[PDB]
Write a protein that binds this DNA or RNA. Structure first.
Ligand SMILES: [Zn+2]
Ligand SMILES: [Zn+2]
Ligand SMILES: [Zn+2]
Ligand SMILES: [Zn+2]
Length: 112
DNA sequence: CTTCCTTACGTTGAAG
DNA sequence: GCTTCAACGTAAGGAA
């Protein structure tokens, strides 16, 4: 029900509406006391502080590799699921089409 | 190729 | 019940 006069965007709650209008003001009052960069919202600065501490709190449950963020970990999860590959049950090689495995399995048949 | 690092939205749930 | 408002979640996309 909340709309931005400028960029014309609707928000569900008032919190994101109030924050969005402050970002428009360009003001950045949340400063990192290590590198002295400023940020418009505190939640942004909280994420920036990881670049100094080096903590990697977001660990994948599969390969156990840790990341600086959850967005970085979310996109990493798109790699543990991908296109399947057929497997010759003799030489254990992989193939990308069934008609390719049938032509290869038929090779093991002719010679033996 | 991945990952870092930035921003922008969202709902949930203590706490007045 | 009605307001925050912090702590998360989702995602995008150039930089490293
Ligand atoms: Zn706007
Ligand atoms: Zn800093
Ligand atoms: Zn993983
Ligand atoms: Zn084979």
């Amino acid at each position: 029900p909340y709309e931005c006069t400028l960029c014309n965007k609707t928000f569900t709650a008032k919190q994101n509406y109030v924050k969005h209008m402050f970002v428009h003001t360009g003001e950045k009052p949340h400063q990192c006391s290590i590198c002295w960069r400023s940020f418009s919202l505190k939640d942004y600065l909280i994420k920036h502080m990881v670049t100094h501490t080096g903590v990697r709190a977001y660990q994948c449950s599969i390969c156990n590799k840790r990341f600086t963020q959850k967005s970085s970990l979310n996109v990493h999860m798109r790699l543990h699921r991908g296109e399947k590959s057929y497997e010759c049950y003799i030489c254990k090689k992989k193939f990308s089409h069934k008609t390719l495995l049938e032509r290869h399995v038929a090779l093991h048949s002719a010679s033996n």
